[PDB]
Subunit: 563 residues, 3 copies
């Protein structure tokens, strides 16, 4: 002893070597002793061969430290191979534990499956928190690299994932929740990683996985080739049947195509997905499709695909989500720098109705002819949406206009534009077609908020709207000029600015009519300084003129007050 | 010796064990020797108990390496407890050092306070650079986790912060500058961290802290519960009384409410804060308010709150900053996917005046009725803002119009629109109310720049403006038709296109007037190809007509040149 | 032996000590043995001096582990100095290797050059993957810190770079590709780093480097001072002669000016650069210029410069790229919070033509007078761009208008607006000047897509366009009133709504003419309910009137259908 102070036999560097019979049977000698960190040394101390573990169960936050690195090659560093017919290599599980396991993981380790085809899992983590897998590899099997169930607060960064998955595998799997829907995968970082040459979902989640607050950022995903096990189904690199808050950002994705192992899209989001998925500022190369969004709130912006050697421009998300999606185009630039798919050219001032606030839950649905393909279904006697009027417009001197693109599901839908419960105007909605419905708000009618409501008896599908100030209002009114003797004239009823615009009328257009006014000399007389007017119609023919018109119309122009 | 080459007693693995009497008195034996790295081994070598340090002072970049992990549990890994009545556990300080300490920190260590209520600091870092605290924990006291004064170039990532703070504590504190305002906290990364169940500011700064270039990104902040010490005051998760360049992005924030330990908002920014704070693309859940911005330039976009179980939609930032803030709505989506707070519906083409360039410092102030609540105060004889005219509009054939929303602080404010020192037109500003002031720029007056100036004698508050091309210009002019005999007519003075629009006039509206024109047949005669015109007013009554009008007006429509 | 189980002499902790003669000659004893990890201990075991390596070649993924930290100071931790006249310290190379090196690097090491002026390289990495350099320093020479050739999948994060470069050095260099253009630098992370007081490019690439998928994020770049070797040429902090997919985001940049060692700009991008460079959300302080973009697709948004003590507002990117660039202003705020350079005020609805899709590669070029300085050159008989018409506009009841800003390179350019191969209308383009060319699409002509084509015989330069719905259409038509006897009148040919607007005409303006209409009383008669009309011109003079006009024009207003 007397090692200048302590004793010798200082197995503080608890390497695998101190334990028992064989590597895997040393197993719980490691674990039974409840040692905190175990060194695993390089492939030199096992004679060029990897240490071979199988079905090792870790019930406590055990650091397995290595002296390898992220990388495919197996000839330098710590290397670990799954055993002949074992289901997993390590199962870090707090199932049955009084206190939940918190910490531990895999540091500096090249982890392989026993064979390039062994279905199963490499590393399972169940009911655990603050697992880290750093500077590692996960490779060489046809099951899942890392399988996660009820794991929180965790980190998987700077690793390689390769030759993983197939028919019933993939990379990192968010499995079903363990018990309650809150026993999910949440607060997990997947960063700085490299994914390559894999089958199944590269990252995925099950139909009951309920994941939340997932970072998938600054990774590199690239096809690379087909592994031992090709895909049996149309596949997506990121396949999340459920997903809540998620950042999927600043990643590369390269060569994901149908012909290349059936990667028909980059991201797929299941119908039952909820929370906000940000798919933003990814740089793609020669990818076939952004993917399929069947559910959730998904925001996609800033993504750019260089088409490279691909035969076609990237296809945009197919969206059938029942929820607001804001899917800005994935820009397609050809390898020569030419844009062949640009930003979506929207109608000026277009707002998809799902982007507006409202007091009723209104599921979105797919319509091929909707501006964004996504439209609200609004049943009878139900608010569409209600929004705040800009403070610059509430000056008593601004006419505004709402144009809404709508389709009746059947006969009898009516849209009303309202200020609160006051009905401003109504439009009957034509069944079965998209049409633009125009509603003007006189300057004296505009208040704090506006709403559209279905006041009819059938469902209306609401696409989007344009709302804003206008500098004129159209006006049509009854006339009855009758039969005029030679030289006789008729003067229309007064058209008060109050009725026309709700505010001073600056001027009007020439008047037009619901029929020919042959032989009528027409002019306008102001009846007040505020732009009220009559139209005068004088028989200029020299003999009796039987007029036919019964309506007159103008465009009335509006500016401010009297100065 | 002759250890196949060297000597034995190879205390190159300098564990705590080689030093002196007790853990803390080993203290400077460690430190006096000036050893670079010290291993601290797991809770097994101290008999299930943590090693207990207090008031240990580190004057040199000392790595304290551990074999623990980020995590709450104290039963596996390196664990360190503050001592009975000690103020701190470690003080990494370069106070008095000839050369500033640069490096060192805390690697793989679960750090606890002696008791869940001990006010003080766990870890203080003063006058230091390139401190790293990685894979750690900071927990179990009512003071500050990490206290920072004059620390630069540093990193605190992948840690847990929990059961910290209260009345006079919090998580990570940016304390006052040490001496000169440049002895601040700058270039610090706070990433990949987990904050939980804490009181005070989770991250904060003092009124004299002057921090700059701070990342707070891809962390998880969640209420979790109330710790031993509840908040005594209304609190904010991020409370920066001073802050310059800062990225606060891609974080989760969950369940921050008044009822939940008085977290009345997520972010608060002090009045004296300066540099650009980016609060962007955070995903919130059941949070009560974005917070209160009392100062600085703050940009907030891309944030989305899922309201979840909260009773109310998230409230938006209250902003009283004297400086430009660009605060895009934090979108509120209900747990069912329904938007109940959408993006702010702005007037079409609205620009808040603080977003424009100008040659004078003009502090912003709060006005409830301003479009963004933030408005400029512009004293007499002072420029409001000046901007560049788009090159597409400077073709000699484009009329433009400025609409500015303004309120006089008192009688006598005047806004002038100018091209350089040339005054284009003026509007007297009404005291005490918001009104829209309209200024037209004839096509022949538009040059390189435009400016608004207060040319009056009182302050004007400037909200925002709309500036853009228009396809018409309103025009009003003097007439004097007088008394007309039967059949007699009056022709107005010529209305030159040069005066009307400054360019060819395409057409005009019907003319209106400052009073009734009963009995007057009115038409327009072109006087040139370029749209100049007179109005003719003919007495169509058959007897003497005494007219009353003295002004005529039209809308004049403009298109391009003559072809 | 019988070390309670194993043998003693357990040189599993392979420190440098076990090898051979001297540090560098231990060289391949380390390497020949093919040891995976080598510890290098602190400056204490070499008597206060750094271990001094030179021209050490590593052909296999060797971890060189240290117990230092990122930092300038050389008195605590592992420190390594280049030798007297050696070209490099380590060359991690897989040149000649059967299997490519994958893994290894530099962990916890302060790496210095022998002298502050030694041109050369500190660390070269050639033909390698998954190199990591973490928690390190790279300092004290006038050559390159890290030189990279054919390195992939790699990471350089959390390091210090200082007193590096000069005339023929810099920080991190992406050197030429090794053999095929795919033997590049790709999938590399440069994060969390600190750059300081350096010359040359801080990060750069050669004219043949072809880099792809580079992160440069959340670093701190600051002038700091001039090193031993000042710049001999105008320099850029980031100088990438070639660069494809790259994220340059969330970085600080501080005090980069011409006077401060000739940093004339922050980023320079070479003419032959391709793939999408995102320069986004950087926070600059007292920087002189964003830089010079001579090539590639570059997207720049969210950047803000606080001018601080600098004398001038930051200058914006100079752009001469042949490819689409979307360069949103770098906002300039003065140290007092006043904006002095705001967002670019664009014409309302402006789209630079390069942002649109098209079937032909059309290189962009510089024009000082272009809205963005970047314009397309479109030769004869070639499409300009083609875009999709918004679905809200394709209702058969919407008139739209294209305004395109264009300059003929020479006489004879013609722009045609077309729906597919159907020509809607044409404009001859004036040589040598920018002009706005207006094209109206009647409501009955609008289909699925629109295109502009050069149908002339010279090149046209295309700046940008405005495309959108309009609520009127201008119309001009032939008349022949001739000589009218007293009281006689002329009625123009019918103006069908079909010809005027392609849809119902709501009203028209007063008619104007190609000359004076003195003495003509003019009115309009509707000829149908759908807004067709004639103009009547009656001689109101009482004697023969010889008219002179031959054209009449109106603005025609359009709304929806008949209800």
């Amino acid at each position: 002893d007397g090692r200048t102070i302590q004793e010798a036999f200082d197995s503080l560097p608890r390497l695998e070597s101190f334990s028992g019979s064989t590597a895997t049977d040393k197993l719980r000698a490691a674990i039974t002793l409840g040692v905190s960190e175990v060194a695993i040394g390089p492939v030199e101390g096992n004679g060029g061969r990897p240490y071979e573990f199988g079905d090792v169960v870790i019930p406590y936050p055990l650091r397995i430290v290595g002296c390898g690195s992220q990388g495919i090659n197996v000839t330098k560093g710590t290397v670990l191979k799954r055993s002949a017919g074992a289901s997993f290599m390590f199962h870090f599980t707090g199932e049955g534990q009084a206190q939940r396991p918190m910490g531990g993981g895999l540091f500096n380790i090249n982890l392989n499956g026993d064979t390039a085809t062994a279905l199963g899992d490499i590393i399972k983590v169940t009911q655990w928190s603050y697992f880290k897998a750093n500077n590692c590899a996960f490779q060489n099997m046809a099951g899942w690299g890392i399988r996660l169930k009820d794991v929180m607060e965790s980190n998987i960064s700077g690793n390689l994932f390769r030759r993983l998955g197939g028919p019933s595998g993939g990379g990192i799997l968010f499995d079903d929740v363990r018990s309650a829907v809150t026993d999910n995968v949440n607060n997990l970082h997947i960063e700085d990683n490299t994914f390559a040459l894999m089958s199944g979902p590269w990252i995925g989640s099950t139909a009951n996985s309920n994941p939340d607050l997932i970072w998938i950022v600054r990774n590199k995903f690239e096809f690379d080739g087909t592994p031992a096990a090709p895909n049996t189904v149309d596949s997506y690199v990121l396949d999340f049947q459920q997903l809540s808050r998620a950042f999927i950002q600043d990643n590369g994705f390269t060569h994901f195509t149908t012909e290349r192992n059936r990667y028909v899209g980059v991201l797929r989001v299941g119908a039952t997905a909820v929370g906000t998925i940000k798919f933003e500022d990814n740089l793609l190369f020669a990818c076939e499709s952004a993917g399929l969004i069947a559910g959730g709130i998904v925001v996609s912006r800033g993504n750019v695909n260089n088409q490279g050697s691909a035969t076609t421009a990237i296809k945009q998300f197919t969206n059938t989500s029942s929820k607001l999606c804001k899917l800005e185009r994935v820009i397609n630039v050809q390898s020569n720098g030419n844009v062949s798919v640009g930003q979506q050219i929207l109608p000026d001032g277009y707002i998809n109705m799902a982007e507006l606030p409202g007091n009723t839950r209104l599921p979105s649905e797919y319509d091929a002819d909707g501006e964004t393909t996504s439209v609200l279904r609004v049943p009878a006697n139900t608010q569409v949406r209600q929004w705040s009027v800009p403070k610059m417009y509430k000056d008593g001197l601004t006419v505004t206009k709402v144009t809404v693109r709508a389709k009746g599901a059947a006969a009898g839908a009516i849209l009303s534009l309202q200020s609160g419960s006051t009905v401003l105007s109504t439009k009957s909605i034509d069944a079965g077609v998209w049409k633009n419905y125009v509603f003007y708000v006189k300057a004296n009618q505009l208040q704090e908020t506006l709403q559209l409501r279905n006041t009819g008896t059938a469902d209306v599908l609401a696409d989007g709207m344009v709302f804003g100030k206008v500098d004129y209002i159209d006006w049509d009114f009854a006339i009855a000029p009758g039969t005029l003797a030679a030289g006789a004239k008729y003067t229309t009823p007064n058209q008060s600015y109050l009725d026309v615009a709700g505010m001073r009328v600056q001027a009007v257009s020439i008047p037009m009519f619901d029929g020919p006014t042959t032989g009528l000399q027409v002019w306008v007389e102001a009846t007040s300084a505020n732009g009220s007017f009559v139209v005068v119609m004088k028989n200029d023919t020299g003999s009796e003129l039987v007029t036919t018109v019964t309506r007159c119309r103008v465009r009335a122009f509006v500016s401010k007050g009297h100065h």
